[PDB]
Amino acid sequence: KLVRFLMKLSHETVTIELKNGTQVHGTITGVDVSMNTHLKAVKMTLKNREPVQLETLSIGNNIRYFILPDSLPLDTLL
Amino acid sequence: VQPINLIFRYLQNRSRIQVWLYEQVNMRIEGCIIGFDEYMNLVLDDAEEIHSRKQLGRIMLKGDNITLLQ
Amino acid sequence: AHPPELKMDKKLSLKLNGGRHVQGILRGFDPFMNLVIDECVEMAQNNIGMVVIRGNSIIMLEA
Amino acid sequence: SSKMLQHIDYRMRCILQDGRIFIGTFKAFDKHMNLILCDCDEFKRVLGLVLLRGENLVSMTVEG
Amino acid sequence: TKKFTLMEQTLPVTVYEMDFLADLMDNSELIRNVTLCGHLHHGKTCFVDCLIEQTHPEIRKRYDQDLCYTDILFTEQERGVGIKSTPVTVVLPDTKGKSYLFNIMDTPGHVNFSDEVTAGLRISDGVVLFIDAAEGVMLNTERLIKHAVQERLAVTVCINKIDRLILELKLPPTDAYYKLRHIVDEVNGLISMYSTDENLILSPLLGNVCFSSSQYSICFTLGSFAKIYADTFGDINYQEFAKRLWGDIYFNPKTRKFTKKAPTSSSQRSFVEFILEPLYKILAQVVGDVDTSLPRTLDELGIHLTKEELKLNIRPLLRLVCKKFFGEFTGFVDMCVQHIPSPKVGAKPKIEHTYTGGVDSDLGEAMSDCDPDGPLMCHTTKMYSTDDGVQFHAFGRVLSGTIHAGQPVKVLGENYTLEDEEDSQICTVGRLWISVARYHIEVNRVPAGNWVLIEGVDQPIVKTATITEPRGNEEAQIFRPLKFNT
Amino acid sequence: PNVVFIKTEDPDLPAFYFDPLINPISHRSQEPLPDDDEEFELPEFVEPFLKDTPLYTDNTANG
Amino acid sequence: VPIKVLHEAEGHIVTCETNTGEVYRGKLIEAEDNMNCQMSNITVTYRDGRVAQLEQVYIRGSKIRFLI
Amino acid sequence: PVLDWFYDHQPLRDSRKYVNGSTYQRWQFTLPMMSTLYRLANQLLTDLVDDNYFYLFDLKAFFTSK
Amino acid sequence: NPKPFLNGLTGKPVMVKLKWGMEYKGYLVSVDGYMNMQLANTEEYISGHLGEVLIRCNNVLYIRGV
Amino acid sequence: GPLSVLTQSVKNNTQVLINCRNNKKLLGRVKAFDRHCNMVLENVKEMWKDRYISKMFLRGDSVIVVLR
Ligand SMILES: Nc1nc2c(ncn2[C@@H]2O[C@H](COP(=O)(O)OP(=O)(O)OP(=O)(O)O)[C@@H](O)[C@H]2O)c(=O)[nH]1
Ligand SMILES: [Mg+2]
Q1: Nearest to F27 among E178, E273, E292 (CB)
Q2: Distance, CA of C62 to CA of G35 (rounded, Å)
Q3: Domain residue extents for chain I
């Protein structure tokens, strides 16, 4: 259910926080059935340091929290 | 000697065996053992939970929570 | 979930997760990498005769 | 098991679980995310061809 | 009253919510602009009826007679032929469950109204061509292939009415495969004769060819039916199976492997043995053995029906069985996702082929980014009438900018240029409608790359026009007038 | 659209059969096929859906 | 092709990095399902650079992250 | 399948799986005996399969003609 | 197997110590097959009593069954 | 099972506070659960100061405890 919503929200720009404290905000291009995802134009903030722009970033299940965008109705996927 | 037969012999003996937490030396389990599940889940009966030990009765421990039991 | 690829009735040491270690004679393996140790000497040497070690905390065993 | 197609020939920067950062050109990857990368230069050392496990790679980024 | 309406009084349930459609309104990467076109009576309208009945829960086809959602004029009801092309904006899921916005332009199949189809070819980005399996390639299919190549659009083909191979012609399934492959080869030969580019080649292996029966709610590519096997058996990877299904590949059950050589004599291909023959057996078990072996066959497929559903007549029961089996229409949606580009992606050849100022002009790259902010370039070609027939509503896509209700705006005609300013005329905007065929949705802001009805601009426009900002304007050229096939 | 329905006379013929009244297809430039036996063998216990079910019964032509 | 590359690396001495941070170089003999390989001539730096020698070391795949 | 009850006054009124009851309102049949009835009614039935025979010879054409 | 221990823990009070040093004692409501437990009227510390709470599959180092 | 449905009903009708294993307590309307304990929550403020987020999806491996 949550993986279906993550695959459904795989177009807009989202921010994903890893378990190592790394947070990357960018447009999700492709999300698999697992937690592995690909992001583009990622303004990835380093661990207590400055952020950098990455053209293509691929993340196993190392991501702890993901900030989904506001495009989520009550019955968009429910 | 497989570990299943050794675990069955330790459960049938029900002796005080010192067991350490999973890469954690701050807690040790040494006391009477009541039962063991198929996935190495253990239920104790007033075992010594040494830090300081305080036996209370039924205690449930996970299969992967045990590091070394002797 | 299977046994280790080393089978054993010989004196060997095994450093576990977190830095703990044992040293004794192996008796057998398990599908969850659990081992039975006879005369397990602590390498950090207390022994209780028979020792059962789960494979979740098992890190590296060396002869 | 699907990210190996887009990065089949381009060089990539990999981050391991020990905090190490390397740069190398990936050749093939397994179904359990075991990726083989040639010329894996440690960031300063050179290691050449190396295979990384699925749980080892914390994050990856495209270099080339 | 003037009853030319066929108009719904209120909006239906439509499964999803309207604010989710308003959230999907602004993406311009999950949105596809598709013209359905083909020969007369090739089941395009019934295909839109299946998509509507999949989307709208309380809208159901009657048992005896065919519903026709897009044919809203009473002349189309009495004549039984499509006359005016109708747009439908809908939200559809794929095999992966990702929702996509779909702008579907249902066009008439009669060749005398073929100019109407060209109006849709000004607005949409992709073409889905409907071909009957029994009839094969006809005159208007060839003409629309030539016009779609010459308009530089992506072309995909679905083969409707495959049940006519089974129920009507009673062909053997190998001969049905031969007929389908002959249809695909004829379409590929027509495209290779017409197009100078050889990058586009239609094949079911590439996901360009669908198979459908729009009166029985059947729609599948190879990927969707391999997904049906994947839901039945979770061990397989359905993409490699879809690559291995079509095109003279044989299956060895001893080695369980797909070879290019037949292992024994009288061994069918993988498309016949895995796709066509279970379809034949399903339709034979329904139309011949409805009371003897039908519940056993439905239990083998995991399909459960009630007691009153088995009391139906053969055509609605077969429609219900195929709707329960194939589920929602996902192979066609995946075809339009992975073979018809976005307005953001495919905007550049549209402005290359349409705008007289060209892409080299600065407003050409302003429109080429498909930006919802900036200049407001719109192109209105088709015009619709109201229920009373008094006033008209323009219809068209937005290449750049956003339109607001009440916003003053300038209309530029066909004779406008950089020195002739008498075609320019300024009006306001009454309302904005998202146009489904039998009901309209009131909206306020419509971004770029999306189709929209405009109310209140009907005065200075003859046929088509371009829509621009009145203040903050620039040297804005005119899109080309519609070069007709006939 | 013209109902091209073929009426069968004898019940000895199969229900799905190429009638002589139908004109022959007479089919006469490469296909994007995968590599032969490179990978993707089918697993055990997968099959066409109605393999045990026959293609046609005696009531099929009548229906 | 990583499994074939790992199977083709048998009989040679290679280095690897631990998941904790250590580095060890040795020559493998057998491989397991979870990469719990057995190796000899292990030059274990013990995560500090202090070189020590080990033989017939059977280390699980969770301890060693990747090759180095 | 029609041999038992073809010439009764009320043919299948006593049966419960075929008719609704003795008011004899709704009927549900099976396909082999439906094909038997279709074969038996061959003389009084048309041979056409579509309405394309009635091009200018149907009700709307006759209304226009009137 | 802990299936009978999970079945016998319904409507009864027990305590669980987390891996982060959080001990919570209270009346158990339901426990899943992967040791994902939910309780009611539980007092916790690492804190206080909040009422009905739930736990993860392996978030507890040891559970002291009261 | 039904306790998770009751927790989802309480999180629909009120604010549910979940303390993850990464020392973060997030309070908000939890909308969806999962078989792998993954939680999708709407309008959730996570304190680890409380920072507000619109929609948050968290895997069940990083979760520790939850309450209404
Ligand atoms: N056998 C069979 N007949 C179909 C199928 N789908 C549609 N038809 C028939 O084909 C007829 C014509 O199709 P329409 O519904 O008018 O759609 P269309 O092809 O776009 O026709 P126009 O709107 O005039 O271009 C319908 O009346 C249906 O009876 C099908 O899947 N199988
Ligand atoms: Mg039609």
Answers
A1: E178
A2: 16
A3: 1-66
